[PDB]
Amino acid sequence: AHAASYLSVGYFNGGGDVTAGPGGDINKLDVTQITHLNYSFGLIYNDEKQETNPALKDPSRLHQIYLSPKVMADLQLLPVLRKQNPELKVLLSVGGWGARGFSGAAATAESRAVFIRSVQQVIKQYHLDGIDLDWEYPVNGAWGLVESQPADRANFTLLLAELHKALDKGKLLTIAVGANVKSPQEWVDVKGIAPYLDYINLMTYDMAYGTQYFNSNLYDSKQWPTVAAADRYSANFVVDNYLAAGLKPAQLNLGIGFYGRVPKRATEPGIDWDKADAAKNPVTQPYFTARETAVFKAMGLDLTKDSYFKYNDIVSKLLNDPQRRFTAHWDSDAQVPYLTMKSAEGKPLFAISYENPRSVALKADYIKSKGLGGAMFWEYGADDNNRLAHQLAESLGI
């Protein structure tokens, strides 16, 4: 006898991001289409020896939050955003891909207390509704990209318990978590931290690695199948792995990518580490030649360094390429769009998968049928005239 209520939590890369690039213009965003805005990112002053941002190496601020000048300027504009949407909640997200400092911040009673005091200071100075922690990743360290240790799992739980205790009542505490099956298994005690969190943002994207073609497929593709088992991911598979770990669906937001990736399979041999003499016997081989890589390079995407392509750029540069080099397709099993480019020999080559309005609506339908709490998306600056956010708002009744 009543309808559901859903979240739509939009990350916004305002300060700049390691993989997504320099920050966007906050003034472009339509904040009426979202329930929550995760302004990204605050960073962490840290003593990691490999830290290359010298601002973060200030020893007098160790374990506190760093806000760049652009982040501080953008956060000044919150009163304007709140007037636009009086129901909007605004959090600062701390961390992001490659962001150092969480392992050390979490490590001791003393370090945690410094970090928590800094969270409290920032929330009060900028009048935030809460804080989102995007630690990529406890225990795993993103495969050595940031410092990590096995104690990170338990220390993250302590940090969240203590931060929950320190936050004013009514403030929000949220986190983002990885797609990798090891995240709920080994990196993060999801069951243990659930009582401290308002909701959990699932990073159900960045799957176009190894032998997998699709970046954010809802279900596995059959036409374009992943070869190695350890690479075989889908948004639904990730959701089920988190549900198996004992999270309730209503606490979860399904992450949706407002971007695509050229699969690594296009340019790098795909290794199945479950095979004999694996590194010498790749199970997939690159199908881009210099011809294809040059097309992407000319558009500003150097595939030797990165594969990220914003949705707005997919629309302007790929779909609407004046030379008509890219053909749009739909994968009915995966429930997402993808583009092909024609090889010199005439064969369609899988160039990139992404999300469009139809696929965003299908992920909203999944949210509704699975009883998830809502959607999250990365990130609003990559939308095309706020269209994907609008589709999500419409589909979820925001």
Coordinates of N, CA and C in Angstrom, one line a residue, residues 74-201:
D74 N 35.1 25.4 -3.9 CA 33.9 24.8 -4.3 C 33.0 24.6 -3.1
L75 N 33.5 24.2 -2.0 CA 32.7 24.0 -0.8 C 32.1 25.3 -0.3
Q76 N 32.6 26.4 -0.7 CA 31.9 27.7 -0.4 C 30.6 27.9 -1.1
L77 N 30.5 27.2 -2.1 CA 29.2 27.3 -2.9 C 28.1 26.4 -2.4
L78 N 28.3 25.7 -1.3 CA 27.2 24.8 -0.9 C 25.9 25.6 -0.6
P79 N 25.9 26.8 0.0 CA 24.6 27.5 0.2 C 23.8 27.7 -1.1
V80 N 24.5 27.9 -2.2 CA 23.8 28.1 -3.5 C 23.2 26.7 -3.9
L81 N 23.9 25.6 -3.8 CA 23.4 24.3 -4.1 C 22.2 24.0 -3.2
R82 N 22.3 24.3 -1.9 CA 21.2 24.0 -1.0 C 19.9 24.8 -1.3
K83 N 20.1 26.0 -1.8 CA 19.0 26.8 -2.2 C 18.3 26.1 -3.5
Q84 N 19.1 25.6 -4.4 CA 18.6 24.9 -5.5 C 17.8 23.7 -5.2
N85 N 18.3 22.9 -4.2 CA 17.6 21.7 -3.7 C 17.7 21.6 -2.2
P86 N 16.7 22.1 -1.5 CA 16.7 22.1 -0.1 C 16.7 20.8 0.6
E87 N 16.4 19.7 -0.2 CA 16.5 18.4 0.3 C 17.9 17.7 0.2
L88 N 18.7 18.3 -0.6 CA 20.0 17.8 -0.9 C 20.9 17.6 0.4
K89 N 21.5 16.4 0.5 CA 22.6 16.2 1.5 C 23.9 16.3 0.8
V90 N 24.9 16.9 1.5 CA 26.2 17.0 0.9 C 27.3 16.4 1.9
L91 N 28.0 15.5 1.4 CA 29.1 14.9 2.1 C 30.4 15.2 1.4
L92 N 31.5 15.2 2.2 CA 32.9 15.2 1.6 C 33.3 13.8 1.5
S93 N 33.8 13.3 0.3 CA 34.5 12.0 0.3 C 36.0 12.2 0.4
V94 N 36.6 11.4 1.3 CA 38.0 11.4 1.5 C 38.6 10.1 1.0
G95 N 39.6 10.3 0.2 CA 40.3 9.2 -0.4 C 40.3 9.2 -1.9
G96 N 39.9 8.1 -2.5 CA 39.9 7.9 -3.9 C 41.0 7.0 -4.4
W97 N 41.0 6.7 -5.7 CA 42.0 5.8 -6.2 C 43.4 6.5 -6.1
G98 N 44.3 5.7 -5.5 CA 45.7 6.2 -5.3 C 45.9 7.0 -4.1
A99 N 44.9 7.3 -3.3 CA 45.0 8.2 -2.2 C 45.6 7.5 -1.0
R100 N 46.7 8.0 -0.6 CA 47.5 7.4 0.5 C 47.0 8.0 1.9
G101 N 47.5 7.3 3.0 CA 47.2 7.8 4.3 C 46.2 7.1 5.2
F102 N 45.3 6.3 4.6 CA 44.4 5.6 5.4 C 45.0 4.6 6.3
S103 N 45.9 3.8 5.8 CA 46.5 2.7 6.6 C 47.2 3.3 7.9
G104 N 47.9 4.3 7.8 CA 48.5 5.0 8.9 C 47.5 5.8 9.8
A105 N 46.6 6.4 9.2 CA 45.5 7.1 10.0 C 44.8 6.1 10.8
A106 N 44.5 4.9 10.3 CA 43.7 3.9 11.1 C 44.5 3.2 12.1
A107 N 45.8 3.3 12.1 CA 46.7 2.3 12.8 C 46.7 2.3 14.3
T108 N 46.5 3.5 14.9 CA 46.6 3.6 16.4 C 45.4 4.5 16.9
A109 N 45.2 4.3 18.2 CA 44.2 5.2 18.9 C 44.5 6.6 18.7
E110 N 45.8 6.9 18.8 CA 46.2 8.4 18.6 C 46.0 9.0 17.1
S111 N 46.4 8.1 16.2 CA 46.2 8.5 14.8 C 44.8 8.6 14.4
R112 N 44.0 7.7 14.9 CA 42.5 7.7 14.6 C 41.9 9.0 15.2
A113 N 42.3 9.3 16.4 CA 41.8 10.5 17.1 C 42.1 11.8 16.3
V114 N 43.3 11.9 15.8 CA 43.7 13.0 14.9 C 42.8 13.1 13.7
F115 N 42.6 11.9 13.0 CA 41.9 11.9 11.8 C 40.4 12.3 12.1
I116 N 39.8 11.7 13.1 CA 38.4 12.0 13.5 C 38.3 13.5 13.9
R117 N 39.2 14.1 14.6 CA 39.1 15.5 14.9 C 39.1 16.3 13.7
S118 N 39.9 15.9 12.7 CA 39.9 16.6 11.4 C 38.6 16.5 10.7
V119 N 38.1 15.3 10.6 CA 36.7 15.1 10.0 C 35.7 16.1 10.7
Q120 N 35.7 16.1 12.0 CA 34.8 17.0 12.7 C 35.0 18.5 12.4
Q121 N 36.3 18.9 12.3 CA 36.6 20.2 12.0 C 36.1 20.6 10.6
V122 N 36.3 19.7 9.6 CA 35.9 20.0 8.3 C 34.4 20.0 8.1
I123 N 33.7 19.1 8.7 CA 32.2 19.1 8.7 C 31.7 20.4 9.3
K124 N 32.3 20.9 10.4 CA 31.8 22.1 11.0 C 32.1 23.3 10.2
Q125 N 33.4 23.4 9.7 CA 33.8 24.6 8.9 C 32.9 24.8 7.7
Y126 N 32.7 23.7 6.9 CA 32.0 23.8 5.7 C 30.6 23.4 5.7
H127 N 30.1 23.1 6.9 CA 28.7 22.7 7.1 C 28.2 21.6 6.2
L128 N 28.9 20.5 6.4 CA 28.6 19.2 5.6 C 27.6 18.4 6.4
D129 N 26.8 17.6 5.6 CA 25.9 16.6 6.2 C 26.6 15.3 6.6
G130 N 27.8 15.1 6.2 CA 28.5 13.9 6.6 C 29.8 13.7 5.9
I131 N 30.3 12.5 6.0 CA 31.6 12.1 5.5 C 31.5 10.7 4.9
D132 N 32.2 10.6 3.7 CA 32.3 9.3 3.0 C 33.7 9.0 2.9
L133 N 34.1 7.7 3.3 CA 35.5 7.3 3.2 C 35.6 6.3 2.0
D134 N 36.6 6.6 1.1 CA 36.8 5.9 -0.1 C 38.3 5.4 0.0
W135 N 38.5 4.4 0.8 CA 39.8 3.8 1.0 C 40.0 2.7 0.0
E136 N 41.0 2.9 -0.9 CA 41.2 1.9 -2.0 C 42.6 1.4 -1.9
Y137 N 42.9 0.3 -1.1 CA 41.9 -0.5 -0.4 C 42.6 -1.0 0.9
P138 N 41.8 -1.2 2.0 CA 42.4 -1.8 3.1 C 43.0 -3.2 2.8
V139 N 44.1 -3.5 3.4 CA 44.8 -4.8 3.4 C 45.4 -5.1 2.0
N140 N 44.9 -4.6 1.0 CA 45.3 -5.0 -0.4 C 46.2 -3.8 -0.9
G141 N 45.8 -2.6 -0.5 CA 46.5 -1.4 -0.9 C 46.5 -1.1 -2.4
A142 N 45.4 -1.6 -3.1 CA 45.3 -1.5 -4.5 C 46.6 -2.1 -5.2
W143 N 46.9 -3.3 -4.7 CA 48.1 -4.0 -5.2 C 49.4 -3.2 -5.2
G144 N 49.6 -2.5 -4.0 CA 50.8 -1.7 -3.8 C 50.8 -0.3 -4.1
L145 N 49.7 0.2 -4.6 CA 49.6 1.6 -5.0 C 49.6 2.6 -3.7
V146 N 49.0 2.1 -2.6 CA 49.1 2.8 -1.3 C 49.6 1.8 -0.3
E147 N 50.1 2.3 0.8 CA 50.6 1.4 1.9 C 49.4 0.7 2.5
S148 N 49.7 -0.5 2.9 CA 48.7 -1.4 3.5 C 49.3 -2.4 4.5
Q149 N 48.4 -3.0 5.2 CA 48.9 -4.1 6.1 C 47.6 -4.9 6.5
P150 N 47.9 -6.1 7.0 CA 46.7 -7.0 7.3 C 45.9 -6.4 8.4
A151 N 46.5 -5.7 9.3 CA 45.7 -5.0 10.4 C 44.7 -4.0 9.9
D152 N 44.8 -3.6 8.6 CA 43.9 -2.6 8.1 C 42.4 -3.0 8.2
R153 N 42.1 -4.3 8.1 CA 40.7 -4.7 8.2 C 40.1 -4.3 9.6
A154 N 40.8 -4.8 10.6 CA 40.4 -4.5 12.0 C 40.5 -3.0 12.3
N155 N 41.5 -2.4 11.9 CA 41.7 -1.0 12.1 C 40.7 -0.1 11.5
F156 N 40.2 -0.5 10.3 CA 39.1 0.2 9.6 C 37.8 0.1 10.4
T157 N 37.6 -1.1 11.0 CA 36.4 -1.2 11.8 C 36.5 -0.3 13.1
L158 N 37.7 -0.3 13.7 CA 37.9 0.7 14.8 C 37.7 2.1 14.4
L159 N 38.2 2.5 13.3 CA 38.1 3.9 12.8 C 36.6 4.2 12.6
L160 N 35.9 3.3 12.0 CA 34.5 3.6 11.7 C 33.7 3.6 13.0
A161 N 34.0 2.7 13.9 CA 33.3 2.7 15.2 C 33.5 4.0 16.0
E162 N 34.8 4.4 16.0 CA 35.1 5.7 16.7 C 34.6 6.9 16.0
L163 N 34.6 6.9 14.7 CA 34.1 8.0 13.9 C 32.5 8.1 14.2
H164 N 31.9 7.0 14.1 CA 30.4 6.9 14.4 C 30.1 7.5 15.8
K165 N 30.9 7.2 16.8 CA 30.8 7.7 18.1 C 31.0 9.3 18.2
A166 N 32.0 9.8 17.4 CA 32.3 11.2 17.4 C 31.4 12.1 16.6
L167 N 30.8 11.6 15.6 CA 29.9 12.4 14.7 C 28.7 12.9 15.5
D168 N 28.2 14.1 15.2 CA 27.0 14.5 15.8 C 25.9 13.6 15.3
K169 N 24.9 13.5 16.1 CA 23.8 12.7 15.7 C 23.2 13.3 14.5
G170 N 22.7 12.5 13.6 CA 22.2 13.0 12.4 C 23.1 13.1 11.2
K171 N 24.4 13.3 11.5 CA 25.4 13.3 10.4 C 25.6 11.9 9.8
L172 N 25.9 11.9 8.5 CA 26.0 10.7 7.8 C 27.5 10.2 7.7
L173 N 27.6 8.9 7.8 CA 28.9 8.2 7.7 C 28.7 7.1 6.7
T174 N 29.4 7.2 5.5 CA 29.3 6.2 4.5 C 30.7 5.8 4.0
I175 N 30.7 4.7 3.2 CA 32.0 4.3 2.6 C 31.7 3.8 1.2
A176 N 32.7 3.8 0.4 CA 32.8 3.1 -0.9 C 33.6 1.9 -0.8
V177 N 33.2 0.8 -1.5 CA 33.8 -0.5 -1.4 C 34.0 -1.0 -2.8
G178 N 35.1 -1.9 -2.9 CA 35.5 -2.4 -4.2 C 34.6 -3.5 -4.8
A179 N 34.8 -3.8 -6.1 CA 34.1 -4.8 -6.8 C 34.7 -6.2 -6.4
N180 N 36.0 -6.2 -6.2 CA 36.8 -7.4 -6.0 C 36.2 -8.3 -5.0
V181 N 36.1 -9.6 -5.3 CA 35.5 -10.6 -4.3 C 36.2 -10.7 -3.0
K182 N 37.5 -10.3 -3.0 CA 38.2 -10.3 -1.8 C 37.9 -9.1 -0.9
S183 N 37.2 -8.1 -1.4 CA 36.9 -7.0 -0.6 C 36.0 -7.4 0.6
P184 N 34.8 -8.0 0.4 CA 34.1 -8.5 1.5 C 34.7 -9.7 2.2
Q185 N 35.5 -10.6 1.5 CA 36.2 -11.7 2.1 C 37.3 -11.4 3.0
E186 N 38.2 -10.5 2.6 CA 39.4 -10.3 3.2 C 39.8 -8.9 3.6
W187 N 39.3 -7.9 2.9 CA 39.8 -6.6 3.1 C 38.9 -5.8 4.1
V188 N 37.6 -6.0 4.1 CA 36.7 -5.2 4.9 C 35.7 -6.1 5.6
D189 N 35.6 -5.8 6.9 CA 34.6 -6.6 7.7 C 33.2 -5.9 7.6
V190 N 32.6 -6.2 6.4 CA 31.3 -5.5 6.1 C 30.3 -5.8 7.2
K191 N 30.1 -7.0 7.7 CA 29.2 -7.2 8.7 C 29.5 -6.5 10.0
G192 N 30.7 -6.5 10.3 CA 31.1 -5.8 11.5 C 31.0 -4.3 11.5
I193 N 31.1 -3.6 10.3 CA 31.0 -2.2 10.3 C 29.6 -1.7 9.9
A194 N 28.7 -2.6 9.4 CA 27.4 -2.2 9.0 C 26.7 -1.3 10.0
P195 N 26.7 -1.7 11.3 CA 26.0 -0.8 12.3 C 26.4 0.6 12.4
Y196 N 27.6 0.9 11.9 CA 28.2 2.3 12.0 C 27.8 3.2 10.8
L197 N 27.3 2.6 9.7 CA 27.2 3.2 8.4 C 25.7 3.5 8.0
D198 N 25.5 4.7 7.5 CA 24.2 4.9 6.9 C 23.9 4.2 5.7
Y199 N 24.8 4.0 4.8 CA 24.7 3.2 3.6 C 26.1 2.9 3.1
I200 N 26.2 2.0 2.1 CA 27.5 1.5 1.6 C 27.4 1.7 0.0
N201 N 28.4 2.3 -0.5 CA 28.4 2.6 -2.0 C 29.3 1.6 -2.7

